[PDB]
Design a protein that fits this description.
By secondary structure, this protein is mostly beta strands. The protein has no helices and seven strands. It is elongated and about 75 Å long.
Length: about 120
């Protein structure tokens, strides 16, 4: 219909940003090793990379991991503490900016051989 509007100049706002990614996948290669994998979220613009921030659930040191590859949807986290929870918050970045991030905490469990058939 008719044209013409009035108001702030909010149009270039971050819209092509990557939507919150899906749950994460932990491998736990070991007591001091792990592997977080996410799912390429929706984004009108091509992603430039990813960010995997992890830190003691309770509250300790926060380590930010940058991904120079927008295709690599998986990273191996090592140098962790045994029997300690870590909040792994994965985030995505696109030509626009940083979108949402998925929360995923893991509990290092050593000396566990699953169930026992009998």
């Amino acid at each position: 219909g008719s044209s013409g509007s009035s108001g702030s100049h909010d149009s270039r706002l971050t819209a092509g940003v990557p939507d919150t990614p899906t749950r994460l996948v932990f491998s736990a290669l070991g007591p001091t090793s792990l592997r977080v994998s996410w799912q390429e979220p929706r984004c009108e613009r091509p992603l430039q990379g990813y960010s995997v921030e992890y830190q003691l659930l309770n509250g300790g040191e926060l380590h930010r991991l940058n991904i120079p590859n927008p295709a690599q949807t998986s990273v191996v986290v090592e140098d962790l503490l045994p029997n300690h929870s870590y909040v792994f918050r994965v985030r995505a970045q696109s030509q626009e900016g940083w979108g949402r991030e998925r929360e995923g905490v893991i509990t290092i469990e050593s000396q566990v051989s699953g169930p026992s058939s009998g």
